Design a protein around this motif. Sequence first.
Motif, PDB file in Angstrom:
ATOM      1  N   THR A  32       0.822  -1.206   0.000  1.00 17.51           N
ATOM      2  CA  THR A  32       0.000   0.000   0.000  1.00 17.51           C
ATOM      3  C   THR A  32       0.857   1.258   0.000  1.00 17.51           C
ATOM      4  O   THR A  32       0.683   2.147  -0.842  1.00 17.51           O
ATOM      5  CB  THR A  32      -0.930  -0.015   1.210  1.00 17.51           C
ATOM      6  N   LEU A  48      -6.821   6.033  -2.630  1.00 11.63           N
ATOM      7  CA  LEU A  48      -7.294   5.172  -1.553  1.00 11.63           C
ATOM      8  C   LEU A  48      -8.805   4.998  -1.611  1.00 11.63           C
ATOM      9  O   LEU A  48      -9.322   3.897  -1.387  1.00 11.63           O
ATOM     10  CB  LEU A  48      -6.859   5.735  -0.206  1.00 11.63           C
ATOM     11  N   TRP A  83      -6.763  -5.624  -2.974  1.00 15.09           N
ATOM     12  CA  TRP A  83      -7.458  -4.489  -2.371  1.00 15.09           C
ATOM     13  C   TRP A  83      -7.402  -4.639  -0.861  1.00 15.09           C
ATOM     14  O   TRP A  83      -8.399  -4.969  -0.214  1.00 15.09           O
ATOM     15  CB  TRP A  83      -8.902  -4.405  -2.870  1.00 15.09           C
ATOM     16  N   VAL A  88      -5.582  -0.205   3.832  1.00 13.27           N
ATOM     17  CA  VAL A  88      -5.963   1.050   3.194  1.00 13.27           C
ATOM     18  C   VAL A  88      -6.624   1.974   4.207  1.00 13.27           C
ATOM     19  O   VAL A  88      -6.351   3.176   4.235  1.00 13.27           O
ATOM     20  CB  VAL A  88      -6.869   0.795   1.976  1.00 13.27           C
TER      21      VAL A  88
END
Lengths: 155, 392
Positions: A32, A48, A83, A88
């Motif tokens: 990330t 994001l 993801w 995140v």
Amino acid sequence: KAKYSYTPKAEAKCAKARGTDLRVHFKNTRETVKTLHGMTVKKAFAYLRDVLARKRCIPFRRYGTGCGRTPQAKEFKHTRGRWPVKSVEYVQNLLKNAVANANTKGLDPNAMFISHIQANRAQQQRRRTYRAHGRINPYMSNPCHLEVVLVTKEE
Amino acid sequence: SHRKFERPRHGNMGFLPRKRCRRERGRIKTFPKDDPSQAPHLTAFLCYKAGMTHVVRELDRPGSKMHKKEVVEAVSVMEAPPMIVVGLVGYAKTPRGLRCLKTVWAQHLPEQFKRCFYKNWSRSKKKAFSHYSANLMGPEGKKAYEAGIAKIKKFACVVRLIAIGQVKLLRIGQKKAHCMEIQINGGSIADKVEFGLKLFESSIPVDSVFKESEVVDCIGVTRGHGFEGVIHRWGVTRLPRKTHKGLRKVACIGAWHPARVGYTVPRAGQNGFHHRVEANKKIYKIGKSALVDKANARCETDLTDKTITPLGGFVRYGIVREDYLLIKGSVPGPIKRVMTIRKALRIKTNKAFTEEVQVKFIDTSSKFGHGKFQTREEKRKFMGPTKKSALR
RNA sequence: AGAGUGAUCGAAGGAUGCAAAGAACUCCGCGAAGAGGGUUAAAAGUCCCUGAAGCCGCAACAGGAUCGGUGGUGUGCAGUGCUGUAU
RNA sequence: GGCAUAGGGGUGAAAGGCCAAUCGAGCCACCUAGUAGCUGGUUCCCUUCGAAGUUUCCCUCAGGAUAGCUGGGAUCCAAUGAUGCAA
RNA sequence: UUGAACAAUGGAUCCUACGUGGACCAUGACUGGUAAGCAGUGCUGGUGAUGCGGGGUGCUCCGAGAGCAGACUUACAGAUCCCGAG
RNA sequence: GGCAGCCAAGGCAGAGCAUCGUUGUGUAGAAAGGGCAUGGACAACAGCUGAUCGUGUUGGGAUUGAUCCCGGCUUGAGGCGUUGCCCAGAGCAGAUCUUGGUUGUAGUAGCGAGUACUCCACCUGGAGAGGAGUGGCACCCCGCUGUGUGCGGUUGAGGACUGGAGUGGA
RNA sequence: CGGUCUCCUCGACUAGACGUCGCUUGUCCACGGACGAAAUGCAGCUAAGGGAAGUCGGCAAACUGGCCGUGCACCUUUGGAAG
RNA sequence: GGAUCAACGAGAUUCCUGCUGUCCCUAGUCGCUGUCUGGUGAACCAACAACCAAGGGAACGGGCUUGGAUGUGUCAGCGGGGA
RNA sequence: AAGAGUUGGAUUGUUCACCCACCAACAGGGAACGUGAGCUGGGUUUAGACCGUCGUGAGACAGGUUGGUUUUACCCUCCUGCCACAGA
């Protein structure tokens, strides 16, 4: 103490945030932040939002063996992407704290970019998993420290 | 130690790299012989599989038990719109094979051909051939045009005619065109080139290229089936029910030595969507566009004029509304798939090969279900006044 | 402590600071934190003398097909020190 | 549910089965750091010297003792070159 | 003619701590065996304990034996190129 | 190895000094051959140390080598070193070595018996979802744009399971 | 997902404490979500024509199946066999 | 214990019938996997590494020698090798 | 001249053998007597048990018989498909 691994030319033009024992998977937070490294603050936050909405992904460059191929990884000349939701969200909180720190220092955060975002493996916390034939094996959580510096634009 | 009982080998190693092919269009790697003694003519076309049906026809094969007997044959219906000719290409004979010398284009190029140079067309500023088509009117661009033509007429040993297939007339979703190049065979090089130039922006039909009882080759891509195991990919015989952790497998993928699995061992993987050439396919009929004939699928026996589109349309395709071909048997790939049809290469001299075919009956019944009727009027006359008809 | 019905078995575990002076107040956040600002000779921050190796993150720089390797050899090229240095 | 039968002992319509995931002799503490002609390991540098797998005897043949080869300490002797001239 | 040659820092007298006591290779010197990269021996040298040059590679062949360097020269064996040397 | 031509050097007699000659492989093994190094006793250095010990880390120099010395930084003493000699629990790469901490594997294998969930509402710091989304706007307002099939709990409305040898009651 | 003592035990079909479903009681908890969801797998099913040719071997699956009426052979220890 | 032996047997064997995907010869379909994914997340093993041929060699090399290949990195599989 | 082929069955755990047929022919062999993290487990080759012979005996038996857990790949490579970067 409070020691970052980034020397800025004028810390009067910076904004810093740190996270300790964040209880997020490290290997996902690393990818990330490696994606988020050079982006501006606006680009970063929009990225994001989009990763959360699954419209674009996070490339798993180093810690991604076994990760699934994606069409959304063409953004970064890669094919494996994911993801990571919890990371995140945690990096969102990190950058929000850094933006608040900028605002406190009297700095337009929309002008700054991300300079030196970074993650470290924190202390691992053990649990017990129970294997066949009467064995016991560990479940160690692999958490992370996070840090970010925002440096104002130079034009 | 030898295997106790022999068996043939599973699969062809000539087709070895059984991978999903790169392009959805069939590549012609070999055109027919030139034979300049013949008159200039085209040697390939682009048809599109519209479905499949069966015909009735009397057999002409002296010495057969079915000689002069009415047989029923399965045919593929290949809808073929006229190909538009946009451009020529010359090929010079270099010691490294052939080298494309020069590509001359037409003056007014269709935007369905311009689409071929854009992955997205509606976000582009559609500038394909803009400056070309302007400078071609221009006098100094007329030079570079008459100079490219003269370049081909002097150094090119192969001349090819670039033609687009007009995928849009099929009324399938696609608005683009399939662009291929066709060898003009026969004649001198200058004769070939001017034959090709005559047809710039000509929209040439398929009966001009092929006859109605002649043998062709169907180049194209086969149906895709995805990742498949050795049992169906390669046809190996599956293990006994008693096996552990798998029947649908290959048991010995190699001997101890060599200490590597070989390319000859059947493995699972991609089945289908390979480039294949199905050779020696007889053309049983060339029917005219249904918009102009309205009776193209009528034969010596039929009393009602009918079109080859069956009752309820071709399944997953729709109406056939262009010049169609009746290929004998099956052609590669699904329907809606683009099949290059080339003049035959593995030519025989049987009567099966050099035989005239006349279709006596074309089955136009419903292929969506079991169609008892060849015509909606036949269906009416059998199932007469119903509630919906008497309510109309 | 823990294990075994039991007879029995049986660990790991030392060091803030001179002095708690144990981190006031401010911004942000739900909050922990964080950014400031402080105590102190110093954070030495109740995990507290120091903090090695192994391993890991980041930045910079240098390279990146080939057991054509690690290592050795003799040069070279970049970066980087050290010693001496005549009139 | 209560009670009874205990380790060379119990119990067994007998499988040497079963007696706390343990049984052709349970487990627990101690003798006990049992013994092992057998396997594995045996921690710094330089210099110098430097082998044997052959003899005999042995319940000896994967081992020993015994000569041999291998190192060191020596004792009595032996042996052991070398002046540019001038003064 | 000090009565053969050559060599010789050597002869005598002891004490003493160890390792070894599985060997293997080569040769009309052979024995058993059809034979074996088999088994057992003899003389000597090697390997083990030994690197270096050559035999493409190879514990045993051929040369030669190994402190660190410089120059010259060679052994075995080599010179189409790989690879120094026509 | 002073009783020397003189200075320079050597000057600890198993040392040192000068010249010459010979010889340099090595497993097991050895050396009354020579050294490096660790803990501590007895002694010497009127040894060093808050003008910063020791540890460690990074560079440099010395050494055939074991190893030794120094600069920088950490660190700050609840200190250390050099020489002679003595007493040793005195040197590691291995022992399926002991104890501790780790790495790749790897964000992988997996987390698939017991049929099953869904909608609205409320509870929230947030949970019909944005970090200052974007243009006017100079925060209000008016526009535009994005939002993952969506945490947890509990009413209610549905759908289902237990089905009395029960997922009930003792 | 193992084991572990006893008690109470409704309605319909049914011979039924089988099996299937329902009132009372209790529960929706087992890590989930998308994609018709590759290959392979573990499970449920089918399959033309043939019918053990498969395999050490009809292994595995299939056939049959409740009840009523008629009826039932060899052999027998006279009981059975026998559904 | 020898020989017959009714009945019985998850005993061992053979034949017949019926039935069948056991097979010719496979195909289709379906649930749960796997497959993609959010949260979580081990272990086995590990000298170092990880493309071959031949040769020689502790006589069957990933490394050596002479050749032939070889751009780096993936994802799902896979059971030839890693004696 | 090694391109293609070299079969269906009965008995037997069998390799082999031997028959029944079909066929152009039903050649011989190798690959860790190829191939068990591919399968099977019929056989050999545990523990149970029976017979025969042997032994005083426990027990033995290339004498016969019956019944008997075949585990793990997600690592690396090869192979199969799949994809990107080509940046060194």
